[PDB]
Paper text:
We devised a method that we call pre-stabilization of a GPCR by weak association (PSGWAY) to purify Ste2–LF because of its inherent instability. The structures were determined by single particle cryo-EM to overall resolutions of 3.1 Å (ligand-free) and 2.7 Å (Ste2–Ant), with two separate structures of Ste2–Ag determined to resolutions of 3.5 Å. Mutation of F2045x28 and N2055x29 in this region abrogates both ligand binding and signalling, highlighting the importance of the conformational change. Agonist binding to the ligand-free inactive state of Ste2 causes reorientation of the extracellular end of H5 to facilitate ligand binding, an outward movement of the extracellular end of H6 and a shift of ECL3 (Ste2IL–Ag state), resulting in a contraction of the orthosteric binding site by an average of 27%. The dimer interfaces are smaller in ligand-free Ste2, Ste2–Ant and Ste2IL–Ag (2,166 Å2, 2,138 Å2 and 2,145 Å2, respectively) compared with Ste2AL–Ag and Ste2–Ag–G (2,727 Å2 and 2,519 Å2, respectively).
Numbering used by the authors:
A (entry chain B), B (entry chain A): 5 to 303
C-alpha cells in the first residue's frame, strides 16, 4: 500500500464502469468495461453448474436403476441404461472443454489464433458426436416405447401409423444433428476463429416435436383406457390420475419446457431452458416406460 | 477490422504474457498478466462444478431414500433425511453467492469497498450457519449409529466408553465450527475487505477424526462378528466381506480421502479433496446405518 487515491473516499464512485486497456489483433490500444468482462465470466459460471447437475443426477440414477429393477433383459432397460452413460460421458468431455484455452477470457478479448493448439478442436469435436449419439439413443427409446403399446389386436391399424410418424421423425432428428455437426466441424477445423452455423435451431424443434408426440400418444392412451375400463364391469382410478399426469409418466413437464424454450426469445434464457429439458426427458424416460408397457385394463 | 497488426503473423508470439492496464485503490496505473486473470476465473469455474454435483446427487438421493425404505419412523432415517436437505440448501445459497459482486473479478482486481452492498455479506453469512447445522446433523447421526451397536448385554462396558469418545468429539466439532463462524462474521461485518481467520483448519481435522473413529468402530465390529460366528456352529461370509469393506458400509473411502486431505499441502488440492469427502460421507451414511443396526450373529 504505497498511497491510497482519492477514489477510496468517493461514495458516488462506481467501479465496473472503469476501462480495461488491452492489446488485440487490431493493434495495441483496445478498451473494454469491467461489466462486459464480468458478463463473459458469468456465462461460463452459469453453464458449469448445469453440467455438474447433469453428471451427478445421471451418475446416481444409473446405480439406482440397476439395484431396483428386477427384470434386466428387456431392450428398453438397456437403451435407458446407455442414455445416462452418454450423458455422463458428454458431461466429462464438457468439463475437460470448459477449462481449456478455447473457452477462456484471453481468447475472447484477444482473438489470437496462436493460443489454440491442435487437440482443443478435437475435444470440441468429440462433444458434438456424443450429442448425436445421445439423441439417437433417446429417439430409439421413444420408438421402442411406441412399439409395445399397440401389441394387442384392439387397434392393429393405428399403431402402424403412429410407428410411421415416430420413426421418420427420429431419423429426421438424428440426420439434422449429424449434418449440423459435420458442417460445424469442417468450418471449425478449417479456421479456428469462425462463426458457428445455425439453421433456425431446426434440431431442437424436431426433438421438441418428437417429445410432444410422445406426450400426445400417452395422454390419448389414458383417455382410451378410462373408456375401456367403464364399459366393462371394472373399477376406475381415484388418485392415480394425478400420478399418470403430473408425475412425468406422460412426459408432460419435459414437453412444456421445450415449447417454452423454442418460443421465447434468446434473452429470456433459451440456451438454459433446453439443457434442463434434455436432462428432464432423459430422467423421465424410465417412468414413461412403465406406463406404456403396462396392461390397459388388467387387475 | 480496421488494420491487422504484425502480431497476427508472428508464430512465436505468446498471448497470455501480455499486460492488462487497470485502475485500483492505489491509483491509476496498475498492471497484471492475462494468466493471473485466467487463474482467478478458473477457480470459480472449478468450484461451481463440485457444488452442482452436490446439489444434483443429494436432490436425487432424497426421493430415492423415501421411495425405497420401508420403515420411516426411526430417528436415523429422519437425521439422514435432513442432512441431504441441508446439503441442498447450502448448495442453493452457494449458487446465489457465486454470481454476486463479492466473488467477481472486478472486486478482486479493484478492491473498492463501494462495490459491496448490504445483503452480499448476509448471503455470505447465512452459508456459514448452514455449514454448522450440516456438521451438527452429521455428528448426531454418528452418535445415533454408535448407540444402537452395543444395545445387547455382550459388552455393556465398552459401549459407554465409545459413546463418551464419540459424544465429546461431536460437541467439540460443532463448537469449533460455531466459534469459527462467529469470529469470521464479526470481522467480515466490521470491514468488507479483511482476511478470514483460520486455526490450522482445526475443524476439518476434528471432522476427519470423528469419521476415522466411526471407521475404526465398524471394522472392529466386523472382526468381532467373525470370531462370534465361528465358535458357534454357524456359517460364515464368502463374498460379503468385500461388500462390508469396499462398498462404504464401513465409511472407508470417506476416511481415506480426509487423511489424504489434511496431510497434503494446499498446492495438491486441499480445498478440493474436502468438499468431495463431505459429499461422500453424507452419501455413505445410509449404508453405514444398515450395518450398525444389523444383528451380529442372526440368520
Ligand atoms: C431433478 C433433479 C436432478 C434436480 C434438478 C435441479 C435443476 C432443475 C436446477 C438445480 C440448480 C439450478 C441452476 C442454479 C443456478 C442457475 C444460475 C441462473 O443464473 C442467473 O439467472 C443469474 C446469472 C446470469 O444472469 O447469468 C440461471 C439458472 C441456473 C443455471 C439454475 C437452472 C436450474 C438448475 C440446474
Ligand atoms: C461410466 C461411469 C458411470 C462409471 C462406471 C461405473 C461402473 C463401473 C459401475 C456403476 C454401476 C455399477 C453396477 C451397479 C449394480 C450392479 C448390480 C450388482 O448385483 C446386484 O446388486 C444384484 C445381485 C446381488 O444381490 O448380488 C452387481 C454389480 C453391478 C452390476 C454394478 C457393477 C459396476 C457398475 C457398472
Ligand atoms: C464416462 C467415464 C468412462 C469417464 C470418461 C472420462 C474421459 C472423458 C476422460 C478421462 C481421461 C481424459 C483424458 C486425460 C488426458 C488427456 C490428455 C490431454 O492432453 C492435452 O493436450 C492437454 C494437457 C496438456 O497440455 O498436456 C487431452 C485430453 C485427454 C486425452 C483427456 C480426454 C478425456 C478423458 C479420456
Ligand atoms: C459414476 C461416478 C462414480 C463417476 C465415475 C467416473 C469418474 C471416475 C470420472 C467421470 C468424470 C471425470 C472427470 C472429468 C474431467 C476431469 C478434468 C481433468 O482436468 C484436466 O486435467 C484438464 C483441465 C485442466 O486442468 O486444465 C482432470 C480429470 C477429471 C477431473 C475427470 C476425473 C475422473 C472423472 C470424475
Ligand atoms: C468410455 C468409452 C465409451 C470410450 C470413449 C473414450 C473417449 C472419451 C476417448 C477415447 C479416445 C480419446 C481420444 C484419443 C486421442 C486424442 C488426441 C489428443 O491430441 C492431443 O492434442 C493430445 C496428445 C498430443 O499432444 O499429441 C486429443 C484428445 C483425443 C481426441 C482423445 C479424446 C477422448 C477420446 C475420444
Ligand atoms: C414439482 C417440483 C416442485 C418437483 C417435486 C418433486 C418431484 C421430483 C417428485 C414429487 C412426486 C414424485 C413422484 C411420486 C410418485 C412416483 C411413483 C413411483 O412409483 C412407485 O412407487 C410405484 C407406483 C405407485 O406406487 O403407485 C415412481 C416415482 C414417482 C413418479 C415420483 C417421481 C418424483 C416426483 C415427481
Ligand atoms: C422437476 C423439477 C426439478 C422442475 C423444477 C422447476 C423448473 C422447471 C424451474 C425452477 C427454477 C426455474 C429457473 C429459475 C430462473 C431462471 C432464470 C431466467 O432468466 C431470465 O429470465 C433472464 C436471464 C437469463 O436467462 O439470461 C430464465 C429461466 C430460469 C432458468 C428458470 C427455468 C425453469 C426452472 C429451472
Ligand atoms: C423428472 C423427475 C421426476 C426425476 C426424478 C428422479 C427419477 C429418475 C427417480 C426418482 C424416484 C425414482 C423411482 C423410485 C421408486 C421406484 C419404484 C421401483 O419399484 C420396484 O422396485 C419394483 C420391483 C418389482 O418389479 O417387483 C422401481 C424404480 C422406481 C420407479 C424409481 C425410478 C427412478 C425414479 C423415478
Ligand atoms: C458419487 C457420484 C455423486 C459422483 C461424484 C463425482 C465427483 C467425485 C466428480 C465428478 C466431477 C468431478 C470434477 C470435474 C472436474 C474437476 C476439475 C479438475 O481440474 C482442475 O481443476 C485442475 C486445476 C485447474 O486447472 O484449476 C479437478 C477436479 C474436478 C473439480 C473434479 C472433482 C471430482 C468431481 C466433482
Ligand atoms: C427442495 C428439496 C428438499 C426437494 C423437495 C421435494 C419434495 C416436494 C418431494 C421430494 C420427495 C417427495 C416425497 C417422496 C415420497 C413420498 C411417499 C409417497 O407415498 C405414497 O403414497 C407412494 C409410495 C408408496 O406407496 O409408498 C407420498 C409422497 C411422498 C411423501 C413425496 C412428497 C413430496 C416430496 C417430499
Ligand atoms: C433449498 C430450498 C428448500 C429453498 C431454496 C430457496 C432459495 C434458493 C431462495 C429463498 C429466499 C431467496 C432470497 C430472497 C431475497 C433475495 C434478495 C434479492 O435482492 C436483494 O438482494 C436486494 C435488492 C438489491 O439487490 O438491491 C436477491 C435474491 C435473494 C437473496 C434471494 C436468493 C434466493 C433465495 C435464498
Ligand atoms: C424440487 C427440487 C428438485 C428442488 C428444486 C430447487 C429449485 C427450485 C431452486 C434450488 C436452487 C435455486 C436457484 C439458486 C440461485 C439462483 C440465482 C438467482 O440469481 C439472481 O438472479 C438473483 C437476483 C438478482 O440479483 O437479480 C436466481 C434464482 C436461482 C437461479 C435459484 C432458482 C431456484 C432454484 C433452482
Ligand atoms: C426452507 C426453510 C428451511 C427455511 C429457510 C429459508 C431461507 C432460504 C431464508 C430464511 C431467512 C432468509 C434470509 C433473511 C435475510 C436476509 C438478508 C437480506 O439482506 C438484504 O439485502 C435485506 C435488506 C438489508 O438488510 O439491507 C438478504 C437475504 C437474506 C440473507 C435471506 C436469505 C434467505 C433466507 C436464509
Ligand atoms: C468410479 C469407479 C471406482 C466405480 C464406482 C462404483 C460404485 C459407485 C459402486 C460399485 C459397487 C456399488 C455397491 C454394490 C452393492 C451395494 C449394496 C446395496 O445394498 C444391498 O445389499 C442391496 C442389493 C440389491 O438390492 O440387489 C447398496 C448399494 C451398494 C453399497 C453399492 C453402492 C455403489 C457401489 C459402491
Ligand atoms: C468412490 C467413487 C465415487 C469414486 C471416487 C473417486 C474420487 C475419490 C477421485 C476420482 C477423481 C479424483 C480427482 C482427479 C483429479 C484431481 C486433481 C488433482 O490436482 C492436482 O494434483 C494439482 C492441481 C490442483 O491443484 O488442482 C488433485 C486431486 C483430484 C481433485 C482428484 C481427487 C480424488 C478424485 C475426486
Ligand atoms: C458413491 C457411493 C457413496 C454411493 C452413492 C449413491 C448411494 C447414496 C445410493 C446408490 C445405491 C443406493 C442403494 C440401492 C439399493 C438399496 C437397497 C434397498 O433395499 C430395500 O430395503 C428395498 C428393497 C430392495 O430394493 O432390495 C434400500 C436402499 C439401498 C441400500 C440404496 C441406498 C442408497 C444407495 C447406496
Ligand atoms: C486506456 O485507453 C485510453 C484511450 O482512449 C487512454 O486515454 C488511457 O490513458 C488508457 N489507460 C488508462 C490507465 O486509463
Ligand atoms: C502502441 O500503439 C502506438 C500507435 O498505435 C504505436 O506507435 C506503438 O508502437 C504501440 N506499442 C507501444 C509499446 O507503445
Ligand atoms: C500499461 O502500463 C505500462 C506501464 O509500465 C505502460 O508502459 C503501458 O503503456 C500501458 N499500456 C499499454 C497498452 O501497454
Ligand atoms: C493517471 O496517473 C497520473 C500519475 O499517476 C495522474 O497524473 C493522472 O491524473 C491519472 N489520471 C489520468 C486520466 O491520466
Amino acid at each position: 500500500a504505497p498511497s491510497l487515491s482519492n477514489l477510496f473516499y468517493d461514495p458516488t464512485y462506481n467501479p465496473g464502469q472503469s476501462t480495461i486497456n488491452y492489446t488485440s489483433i487490431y493493434g495495441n490500444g483496445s478498451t473494454i468495461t469491467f461489466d462486459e468482462l464480468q458478463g463473459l465470466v458469468n456465462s461460463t459460471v452459469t453453464q458449469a453448474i448445469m453440467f455438474g447437475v447433469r453428471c451427478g443426477a445421471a451418475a446416481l440414477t444409473l446405480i439406482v436403476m440397476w439395484m431396483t429393477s428386477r427384470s434386466r433383459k428387456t431392450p428398453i432397460f438397456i437403451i435407458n441404461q446407455v442414455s445416462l452413460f452418454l450423458i455422463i460421458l458428454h458431461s466429462a468431455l464438457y468439463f475437460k472443454y470448459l477449462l481449456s484455452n478455447y473457452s477462456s477470457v484471453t481468447y475472447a478479448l484477444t482473438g489470437f489464433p496462436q493460443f489454440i493448439s491442435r487437440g482443443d478442436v478435437h475435444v470440441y469435436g468429440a462433444t458434438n458426436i456424443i450429442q448425436v449419439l445421445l439423441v439417437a439413443s433417446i429417439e430409439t427409446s421413444l420408438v421402442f416405447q411406441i412399439k409395445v403399446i399397440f401389441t394387442g389386436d384392439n387397434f392393429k391399424r393405428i399403431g402402424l401409423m403412429l410407428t410411421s410418424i415416430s420413426f421418420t421423425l427420429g431419423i429426421a432428428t438424428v440426420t439434422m444433428y449429424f449434418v449440423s455437426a459435420v458442417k460445424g466441424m469442417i468450418v471449425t477445423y478449417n479456421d479456428v476463429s469462425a462463426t458457428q452455423d445455425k439453421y433456425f435451431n431446426a434440431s431442437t424443434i424436431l426433438l421438441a416435436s418428437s417429445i410432444n408426440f410422445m406426450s400426445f400418444v400417452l395422454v390419448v392412451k389414458l383417455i382410451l383406457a378410462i373408456r375401456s375400463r367403464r364399459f366393462l364391469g371394472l373399477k376406475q382410478f381415484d388418485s392415480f390420475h394425478i400420478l399418470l399426469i403430473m408425475s412425468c409418466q406422460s412426459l408432460l413437464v419435459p414437453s412444456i419446457i421445450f415449447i417454452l424454450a423454442y418460443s421465447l426469445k434468446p434473452n429470456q434464457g433459451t440456451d438454459v431452458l433446453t439443457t434442463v429439458a434434455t436432462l428432464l426427458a432423459v430422467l423421465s424416460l424410465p417412468l414413461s416406460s412403465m406406463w406404456a408397457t403396462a396392461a390397459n385394463n388388467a387387475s
